[PDB]
Design a protein around this ligand. Sequence first.
Ligand SMILES: [Mg+2]
Ligand SMILES: [Mg+2]
Ligand SMILES: [Mg+2]
Ligand SMILES: [Mg+2]
Ligand SMILES: [Mg+2]
Ligand SMILES: [Mg+2]
Ligand SMILES: [Mg+2]
Ligand SMILES: [Mg+2]
Ligand SMILES: [Mg+2]
Ligand SMILES: [Mg+2]
Ligand SMILES: [Mg+2]
Ligand SMILES: [Mg+2]
Ligand SMILES: [Mg+2]
Ligand SMILES: [Mg+2]
Ligand SMILES: [Mg+2]
Ligand SMILES: [Mg+2]
Ligand SMILES: [Mg+2]
Ligand SMILES: [Mg+2]
Ligand SMILES: [Mg+2]
Ligand SMILES: [Mg+2]
Ligand SMILES: [Mg+2]
Ligand SMILES: [Mg+2]
Ligand SMILES: [Mg+2]
Ligand SMILES: [Mg+2]
Ligand SMILES: [Mg+2]
Ligand SMILES: [Mg+2]
Ligand SMILES: [Mg+2]
Ligand SMILES: [Mg+2]
Ligand SMILES: [Mg+2]
Ligand SMILES: [Mg+2]
Ligand SMILES: [Mg+2]
Ligand SMILES: [Mg+2]
Ligand SMILES: [Mg+2]
Ligand SMILES: [Mg+2]
Ligand SMILES: [Mg+2]
Ligand SMILES: [Mg+2]
Ligand SMILES: [Mg+2]
Ligand SMILES: [Mg+2]
Ligand SMILES: [Mg+2]
Ligand SMILES: [Mg+2]
Ligand SMILES: [Mg+2]
Ligand SMILES: [Mg+2]
Ligand SMILES: [Mg+2]
Ligand SMILES: [Mg+2]
Ligand SMILES: [Mg+2]
Ligand SMILES: [Mg+2]
Ligand SMILES: [Mg+2]
Ligand SMILES: [Mg+2]
Ligand SMILES: [Mg+2]
Ligand SMILES: [Mg+2]
Ligand SMILES: [Mg+2]
Ligand SMILES: [Mg+2]
Ligand SMILES: [Mg+2]
Ligand SMILES: [Zn+2]
Lengths: 138, 208, 124, 104, 99, 83
Amino acid sequence: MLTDPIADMLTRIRNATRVYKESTDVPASRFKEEILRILAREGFIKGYERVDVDGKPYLRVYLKYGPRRQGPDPRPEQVIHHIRRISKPGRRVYVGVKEIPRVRRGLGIAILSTSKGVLTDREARKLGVGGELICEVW
Amino acid sequence: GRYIGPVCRLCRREGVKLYLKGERCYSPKCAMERRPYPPGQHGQKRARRPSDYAVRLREKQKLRRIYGISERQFRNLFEEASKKKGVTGSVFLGLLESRLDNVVYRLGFAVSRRQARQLVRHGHITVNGRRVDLPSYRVRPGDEIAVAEKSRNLELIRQNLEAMKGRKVGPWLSLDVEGMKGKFLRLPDREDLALPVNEQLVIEFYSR
Amino acid sequence: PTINQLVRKGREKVRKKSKVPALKGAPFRRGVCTVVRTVTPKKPNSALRKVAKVRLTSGYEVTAYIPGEGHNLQEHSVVLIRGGRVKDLPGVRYHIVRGVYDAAGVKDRKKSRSKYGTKKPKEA
Amino acid sequence: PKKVLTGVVVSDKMQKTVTVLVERQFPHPLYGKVIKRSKKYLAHDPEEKYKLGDVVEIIESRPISKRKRFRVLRLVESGRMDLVEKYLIRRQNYQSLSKRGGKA
Amino acid sequence: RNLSALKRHRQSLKRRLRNKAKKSAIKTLSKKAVQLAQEGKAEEALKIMRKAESLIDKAAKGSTLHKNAAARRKSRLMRKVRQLLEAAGAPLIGGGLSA
Amino acid sequence: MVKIRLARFGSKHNPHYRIVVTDARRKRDGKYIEKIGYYDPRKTTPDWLKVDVERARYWLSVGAQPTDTARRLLRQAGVFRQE
RNA sequence: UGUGGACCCGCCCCUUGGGGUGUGUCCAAAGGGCUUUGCCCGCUUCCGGAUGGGCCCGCGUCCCAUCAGCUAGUUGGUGGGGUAAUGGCCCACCAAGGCGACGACGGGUAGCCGGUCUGAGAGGAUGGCCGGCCACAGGGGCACUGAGACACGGGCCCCACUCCUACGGGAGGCAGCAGUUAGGAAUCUUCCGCAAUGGGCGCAAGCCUGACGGAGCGACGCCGCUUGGAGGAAGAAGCCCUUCGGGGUGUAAACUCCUGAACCCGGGACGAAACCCCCGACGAGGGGACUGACGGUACCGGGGUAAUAGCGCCGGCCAACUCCGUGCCAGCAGCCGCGGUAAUACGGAGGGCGCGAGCGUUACCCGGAUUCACUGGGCGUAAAGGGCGUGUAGGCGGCCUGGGGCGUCCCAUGUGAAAG
Ligand SMILES: [Mg+2]
Ligand SMILES: [Mg+2]
Ligand SMILES: [Mg+2]
Ligand SMILES: [Mg+2]
Ligand SMILES: [Mg+2]
Ligand SMILES: [Mg+2]
Ligand SMILES: [Mg+2]
Ligand SMILES: [Mg+2]
Ligand SMILES: [Mg+2]
Ligand SMILES: [Mg+2]
Ligand SMILES: [Mg+2]
Ligand SMILES: [Mg+2]
Ligand SMILES: [Mg+2]
Ligand SMILES: [Mg+2]
Ligand SMILES: [Mg+2]
Ligand SMILES: [Mg+2]
Ligand SMILES: [Mg+2]
Ligand SMILES: [Mg+2]
Ligand SMILES: [Mg+2]
Ligand SMILES: [Mg+2]
Ligand SMILES: [Mg+2]
Ligand SMILES: [Mg+2]
Ligand SMILES: [Mg+2]
Ligand SMILES: [Mg+2]
Ligand SMILES: [Mg+2]
Ligand SMILES: [Mg+2]
Ligand SMILES: [Mg+2]
Ligand SMILES: [Mg+2]
Ligand SMILES: [Mg+2]
Ligand SMILES: [Mg+2]
Ligand SMILES: [Mg+2]
Ligand SMILES: [Mg+2]
Ligand SMILES: [Mg+2]
Ligand SMILES: [Mg+2]
Ligand SMILES: [Mg+2]
Ligand SMILES: [Mg+2]
Ligand SMILES: [Mg+2]
Ligand SMILES: [Mg+2]
Ligand SMILES: [Mg+2]
Ligand SMILES: [Mg+2]
Ligand SMILES: [Mg+2]
Ligand SMILES: [Mg+2]
Ligand SMILES: [Mg+2]
Ligand SMILES: [Mg+2]
Ligand SMILES: [Mg+2]
Ligand SMILES: [Mg+2]
Ligand SMILES: [Mg+2]
Ligand SMILES: [Mg+2]
Ligand SMILES: [Mg+2]
Ligand SMILES: [Mg+2]
Ligand SMILES: [Mg+2]
Ligand SMILES: [Mg+2]
Ligand SMILES: [Mg+2]
Ligand SMILES: [Zn+2]
């Protein structure tokens, strides 16, 4: 059993991208999908689609990179240079609207889970609500 | 403790021409002439590459040396500029320039700063009417800095104000050589002051 | 350590050991001599460093040091202690204040006169 | 407002008095983790109407004795000795850490 | 030395004595009644209870008992007497007792 | 009883009181019940005595007793003027 | 006398002893002054306000587990005592309980707070002055009187100590101001005034008020100010260094002129207008009267003299170097390290850097020290994985739906004194 499914998915992606995979698979759960729906919209990934493997529900996440660079090590830049888990079991984190952090002077995001649903640090700020600071991406 | 000692000796150790002497410093004999090297038995010997530190320690000594102010006061003013909104340098310099003794020198009632400082201490100066014998008095925008009435007949004040006829004054200031009055129009902008100092290094020295 | 562990035991604020039990850690402490023997420097050095055994008011009998070119301390000389070790004499952690009590101040001293307790020379 | 608390009846070995164990969750002041914590209040039961495993509300009352400054307000849900259980066992291993011979 | 605050002490003792006396009475008569009633003395029992009630309310007149201290006193009395006459009493003088 | 009096708040040789409702027993510059004004004896500013006749009246009505000086300052502000 | 209120009981409304009502019982008082035949100051009972306070509750509040089990008034009843009042607060009787690793009990240390200092912050440290609360008034116990005390300048007893002792027997308590003495590295005047603010009492006049308002002493702290300004040699003398030509101190001085701290003379405060008194009603309102400790002080005006400088440092860190003396000596030394012969490091000197009525030292607190790491650390070989396992409490939990809404989030509102 995974101790933290969300921290798992965030990683499957972190890992997949360093070897420049085409897409990685993560077991499926609504919450996980809601998160993807954001990476997707915020442009951190090409997108995700629901598949099945050996009968079990997964979430094919199609990753995104940059252009093949020039010089030694022509490996593309990362779209997702960073994707780190914050509120975790054993150490939950909750922020008030006036406390939602501003990721990378704005250039990045933060995904909270509010009672108004999963949202980015702007989306939530705008709706004027805070919640559990799920992760941080940039 | 306003120093009270050799002043052309400070221009020499400063490498830069400091006009903390007023007259004389404007005529071939400034001591800086025929001795652009620091005062001392080793003055002329070749200098060693000053340490990042020194470069700032000197730079501050220069600025402060100019307005002839104690480090005690100089610091407390800098710190005040640290709290105010705006480029600390622009506020620091503006604040140093608001000193009554300094303003007096500007309006030319005195050839130097130390002469001005005395003209302040001996009541020869007036702010908006009443006198003020505090060199540190801060002149805000809109004050009329004049010469003490019962003082306008002093030989030192005559030839000093006479030499101001025809001479232009800082843009932020206003002078009326007739009635011997003056006007602190506005806090000078960095631009307005052309000091031989990079305050940036100063903000850095007090940032240790 | 896990958060649970920290929550469980937390971190430990380690304390500071006073390297000068001049008790009450007071600025200075008064004492009377007992011995005025001389001592020999540590490894790298050699000389005849001057030391005094002071029986402090703080109920402490400790070794002080007598700084300066030369002194005048004897058996029952009351002196003032100030703390400050001597890196060449292990066990000598306190300095004795020249110019206080029976401790005369270094005569004919022009430089660091403030220390060594010596009045301004009346240069005519 | 007279404070109202909710806990489990861990004991009724008293005449008109029940021990109510109340729990409380909250973030750690420095470590953030949401920690648990509890305290037992001696509630007043004049008609000894409540028994072990009853979850009752407790209400801030005017003093009935030392230790007793609370009265049993009502019943929330009954019959859950599963809770009493824990409290009991937490006490179980207690008397097994000293000089008794290690016999527990 | 010397401080005429001694006058205060001097006075407190006369007060201390005056108070002490009014109470002794009350207590002494209060028992008296809690006794006749205890023995079912319908009339003479209430009777005294009435005088007690009085010295009580009276003590409260000034600063002996005062407050609701007198009130307690009375309550405990009219209470006890009524419950002790609960042995075939039948209140006769009907002092401080309601039908 | 409760009172309306002054509380010394200036500085040496620079007295500035603070017309205030306090309990008769408290300190002078102690903890007050409510501030209702201020007064500058040396009248160094065109504004050397503000009062708030409303509040002043509230307390008078419920028992507050004013010092002689305080009553003077209250009157100057017309706390008791009924005309 | 009974407006009323107290108590028993009943009923009603409330709902832990709140409010109402009925019968019965119980309970009031003080007089004084005149502008004397009615005003004033008081008095009594009751309801209410206002202010102050008691008691109770949730949560928070240092170190050691080399302190792990503690308790019998202990825990809870019933009845009583007691109190303004709840309560083992106390008591009689009954029941057998209560508390603890979410650290009981024990040991150590400590008055708590608003705040203060320091830190980018999180945090660390701290609680002096001023304000709030609490506790104590030589040590221990106790109650009396009172609206209130278990009462710092009230009382009683025991104890320790000191003065009186016609030796039986007494009298005392500065942690109130000032002062003395002792301890210590160290902490002030046996001050002036009640003028002002505040307090007690008095109808008032007024009295009392070491609360307070002032002065005094101490660079102890902070801020302001001074010891001068301008001109003055391709540069005195002296001291210094010298590749002996020179180079340095230095425009510094001398010296000319100018302003003129100190100090002298004249004037001279604000803080004070109320209380009181007269008119008016002892009201609103108007009129007058007395009242400054600080102080002849501040401040104003006139006159008027060039009129204190010091301390630290100059090997790297760290701003500033030469000569001489000394020779592992004498000595320096925060750390690294300097001295056994040509020491930028000792001592002196000239010179120089720093700061300046101060400068340096010692002690102590935060910082730098992400060097206890929550923000913000680690454990193969640097300090660090438990010799291994079983599994107790505990921490932690996969995918979908529903209820609840404790955690979490949001809104409004109350609170968050003053000082800072
Ligand atoms: Mg030291
Ligand atoms: Mg005496
Ligand atoms: Mg008797
Ligand atoms: Mg009646
Ligand atoms: Mg009734
Ligand atoms: Mg009822
Ligand atoms: Mg009735
Ligand atoms: Mg009469
Ligand atoms: Mg037991
Ligand atoms: Mg009772
Ligand atoms: Mg009982
Ligand atoms: Mg018993
Ligand atoms: Mg303990
Ligand atoms: Mg203590
Ligand atoms: Mg830090
Ligand atoms: Mg700060
Ligand atoms: Mg802080
Ligand atoms: Mg604190
Ligand atoms: Mg305090
Ligand atoms: Mg109290
Ligand atoms: Mg004593
Ligand atoms: Mg009493
Ligand atoms: Mg006394
Ligand atoms: Mg002594
Ligand atoms: Mg007075
Ligand atoms: Mg008065
Ligand atoms: Mg000159
Ligand atoms: Mg002259
Ligand atoms: Mg008077
Ligand atoms: Mg009249
Ligand atoms: Mg009038
Ligand atoms: Mg003149
Ligand atoms: Mg001179
Ligand atoms: Mg250097
Ligand atoms: Mg020698
Ligand atoms: Mg030295
Ligand atoms: Mg050598
Ligand atoms: Mg050195
Ligand atoms: Mg040397
Ligand atoms: Mg720093
Ligand atoms: Mg740290
Ligand atoms: Mg490490
Ligand atoms: Mg090894
Ligand atoms: Mg190892
Ligand atoms: Mg192993
Ligand atoms: Mg091992
Ligand atoms: Mg082992
Ligand atoms: Mg669980
Ligand atoms: Mg789950
Ligand atoms: Mg659910
Ligand atoms: Mg909730
Ligand atoms: Mg508010
Ligand atoms: Mg505030
Ligand atoms: Zn020059």
